[PDB]
Each structure stands twice: as structure tokens, then as C-alpha cells.
Amino acid sequence: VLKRKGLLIILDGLGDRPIKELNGLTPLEYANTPNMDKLAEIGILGQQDPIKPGQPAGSDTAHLSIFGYDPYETYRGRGFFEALGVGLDLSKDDLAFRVNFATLENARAIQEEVDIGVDFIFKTGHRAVLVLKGMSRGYKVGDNDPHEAGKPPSKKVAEILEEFVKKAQEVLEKHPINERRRKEGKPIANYLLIRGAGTYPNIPMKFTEQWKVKAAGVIAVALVKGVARAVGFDVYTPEGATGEYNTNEMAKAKKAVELLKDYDFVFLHFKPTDAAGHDNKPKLKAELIERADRMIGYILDHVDLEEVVIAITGDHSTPCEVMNHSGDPVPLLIAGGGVRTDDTKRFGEREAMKGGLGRIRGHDIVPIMMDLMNRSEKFGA
């Protein structure tokens, strides 16, 4: 018997709620998406709860779920994923944090200003060794060495962190950029807001070994590249992919198709749809879902569905009326060899409510894909 490849596509924050300006439709329904409708037509639809009914999931916990893990048991914080995201190589005993440059006195800093402000801090010195690297805008990443055990900020690390903020401030309050900054009347980046303490996730085994496959992912956003790396994926970020409105989606598709030739399972992430939701811009979000449809249309023109099982959904809902992640289930579609196609015709939340897959959990998606790919092993007998 022949096994098949897998293609899991995530349209970040896809799910939404009825929008009045869209005649009561959601951005996904309103948006012209002939390719996803074609796939929903020959495929099967369903609704998935990343975590559980009515429970909003952060981007990191939602993706652990999408990759096939139980977020409530594997999740050990965000920091570590962010650190792996910026390309660092950490040990399972390290503790990482997401850092925001702030202003303390008794700024929307530039991406290059944080890289410099970060450099000087690396070159700050306390009891334990640490890595401090900037990521994007006023953000940054802090890594405390073999301190995973104190991941719930414990007493020891908060004193280190507290010495680190005091010490960091000294370094910070002195950089020329800040120096130019107070002169230019701009709020200085002299304080450090540290949060999202995280260690390596408590997962039994990696994705690759669990399912015995080679797995690659086309991803731009740091946090998602981190989760993917933590579970064992070979992450790629093609030229042009920024995870923002100006991203090259056709470049992501081009790469996804390439990777299918050397990997068994490929994961593709598209982030911009989620930003439009956070900013309450229904039309824009719908416009972005349309760019994704064309991206998908490209992939479909270069792959055989009898050889590739395709799944498309969102890691979670991000309603424009909520301007943040919601607990609303997310539309899901699966098409390809092995699928028992239901009678749904288009891809949308109301249609998914009638799909043959029913209402499942986000961590059900990979197992069902793996089974359609004939890569599942029985339990018992």
C-alpha cells in the first residue's frame, strides 16, 4: 500500500464573526476564494477548537495543538519558542523571555534601534550567563542559562531578573540613541519589560519521530517558527516572507511545492490575516484571505491531490469585532486521496458547521491527516 505526503496550511486568525458591513458574512465567506471552495467541494469540512469550546488560545499554544499535541500538558510558556524563533540554539534547561523596551521615569522604537540597544546590553553582567538578542520593533528576547526549573516567575530567577533590569537600565540610560532621544524629545528606551517565561515544551517525542516522517515548514513569524522548531520541523523562510501585509505569499507557495519533493509533511503559515483581525478591518482581512486563495491556487496547480493530502484552517479565531483571539471554533477543510467528500460546496464558517468531520479538537487534525496519508499505526491486536 502507498503512503501519501501532507500539506497543512494555516491562515492565522482565520475565524471570525458575522460582519454587518459584509451583509452578515464573515471575511472568509465574503472574500472571493474560488480555490478553497473547490477544495471544500471535493473534500470534507469541519470545525476545530484549538483548545476547547469557547477557550481563546495564544498563537503558541494553538500551534502546539495544530501540530498534534495537548497544549494543557505540553505548554511550558512562550519565551523558549520566541528564542528558538530568532534562530538561537538553546538547551532544554534554559529559560527564555519576551522583552519589550519601555520608558521609566520618576516609544515605538525602530527595529535597528533595538538591535543596537540589545548589542550593548550583551556586551550587563550578573551571576548567570545570558543571551539578549533583539527581534523586531521595540521587542527583544532574554535567555537565562540552565534556569528552566525557575520557569514560573522561581525566587532565584526573579532576583536575577531584578538585578538585570537595574543593571540593564544603566547600560540603556546611556546609549547615544537614547541620548539623541531625550534631546529630540522622544521617550527613551531605558526600561525592560520582561514576560512570557518559557522552557522547552513537555512533549513525549518530536513530530518527526512520532510519525516517522521528514517535516519542513514555510514560516516567517518568529513565535511560530519557534514552536515548529521545538517539535522538530526544518523551518524555512523564503525571500520576501515577512509575516506582514507586504509578505510574498506566492514565494511561500513556490517554496512549499519545492519542499514537498524532499519532505513527507509540509507546514505553511500565513500571518497577515491575523493582523487585520486585531485592527478591526473586515474588508482588509477578506482582501488578505483572497491573497491566500491565490497562494493556494498556485500550489494546487503544481501538486497531485492523490499523492498529497491537504488541510487548511486557522490556528484560532480573531474576530474583527473582538480585536483579539476569540474562542470561536475555526473552519477546517481536508481534501486529497482517501477523503470521503461530504456535500459542502464552499469554504466558510457556516458551511463548516455542516461538514462531515464534525466538531473536533485542533490536535485531532494531524492524526486524521496521517491516517489519510496511510502513515498511522494501529493500537492493539
Enumerate binding residues for its own copies (CB under 8 A).
22-23, 30, 32, 34, 37-38, 41
Cα 66 from Cα 367, distance rounded (Å): 10
The listed partner (Ca ion, its own copies, Zn ion, none) that binds 22, CB under 5 to 8 Å by sort, is: its own copies
The listed partner (Zn ion, its own copies, Ca ion, none) that binds 59, CB under 5 to 8 Å by sort, is: Zn ion
Strand ranges across the sheet with 265-270: 234-236, 215-218, 265-270, 5-11, 308-313, 330-335, 44-49, 358-361
Name which of 22 and 130 has its Cβ closer to its own copies: 22
For Zn ion, the binding residue among 26, 59, 65, 190 (CB under 5 A) is: 59
Q: Residue 65's beta-bridge partner residues?
A: none
Name which of 22 and 366 has its Cβ closer to its own copies: 22
Q: How far is the CB of 312 from its own copies (least distance, A)?
A: 16
For Zn ion, the binding residue among 5, 9, 12, 33 (CB under 5 A) is: 12
Q: Whose CA is closest to 194, among 95, 296, 128?
A: 95
Strand ranges across the sheet with 130-133: 130-133, 139-144, 95-102, 191-198
Cα 26 from Cα 273, distance rounded (Å): 13
Q: Whose CA is closest to 368, among 329, 314, 306, 311?
A: 311
The residue sitting closest to Ca ion, measured at its beta carbon, is: 341
Determine how β-strand 265-270 pairs with β-strand 5-11.
parallel
The listed partner (Ca ion, its own copies, Zn ion, none) that binds 32, CB under 5 to 8 Å by sort, is: its own copies
Name which of 58 and 358 has its Cβ closer to Zn ion: 58
Q: Residue 19's beta-bridge partner residues?
A: 25
- Decide if residue 16 touches Zn ion (CB under 5 A): no
Residues in contact with Zn ion, counted by CB under 5 A, come to a total of 4
**Interface stretch with Ca ion, choices 20-28, 55-63, 119-127, 335-343 (CB under 5 A):** 335-343
The listed partner (its own copies, Zn ion, Ca ion, none) that binds 315, CB under 5 to 8 Å by sort, is: Zn ion
Name which of 84 and 192 has its Cβ closer to Zn ion: 84
Name which of 48 and 59 has its Cβ closer to Zn ion: 59
The listed partner (Zn ion, Ca ion, its own copies, none) that binds 341, CB under 5 to 8 Å by sort, is: Ca ion
Name which of 40 and 57 has its Cβ closer to its own copies: 40
Phi, psi angle pair for 369, to nearest 5°: -70, -45
The DSSP symbol for 15 reads B
The residue sitting closest to Zn ion, measured at its beta carbon, is: 59
**Interface stretch with Ca ion, choices 173-181, 192-200, 341-349, 362-370 (CB under 5 A):** 341-349
Name which of 30 and 101 has its Cβ closer to its own copies: 30
Phi, psi angle pair for 8, to nearest 5°: -100, 115
For residue 157, the SS3 value is helix
Cα 133 from Cα 118, distance rounded (Å): 6
Q: Which of residues 168-227 bind Zn ion (CB under 5 A)?
A: none
For Zn ion, the binding residue among 82, 143, 315, 342 (CB under 5 A) is: 315
Name which of 228 and 335 has its Cβ closer to its own copies: 335
Task: Report the residue numbers after which the chain has a gap, meaning the C atom sits over 2.5 angstroms from the next written residue's N, or none.
Answer: 106, 123, 153
Q: How far is the CB of 21 from its own copies (least distance, A)?
A: 11
The listed partner (Ca ion, its own copies, Zn ion, none) that binds 5, CB under 5 to 8 Å by sort, is: none
- Cα-Cα-Cα-Cα dihedral of 236, 237, 243, 249, to 10°? -100
Q: Whose CA is closest to 246, among 275, 224, 283, 282?
A: 275
Q: Residue 130's beta-bridge partner residues?
A: 144
Residues in CB range of 186: below 8 A, 6 or more apart? 107
Cα 111 from Cα 131, distance rounded (Å): 18
Name which of 31 and 309 has its Cβ closer to its own copies: 31
For Ca ion, the binding residue among 136, 169, 242, 341 (CB under 5 A) is: 341
Q: How far is the CB of 55 from Zn ion (least distance, A)?
A: 14
Angle at 188 (CA atoms; ends 182, 191), nearest 5 degrees: 145
Name which of 34 and 56 has its Cβ closer to its own copies: 34
Which parts of this chain interact with Zn ion (CB under 5 A)? 12, 59, 274, 315
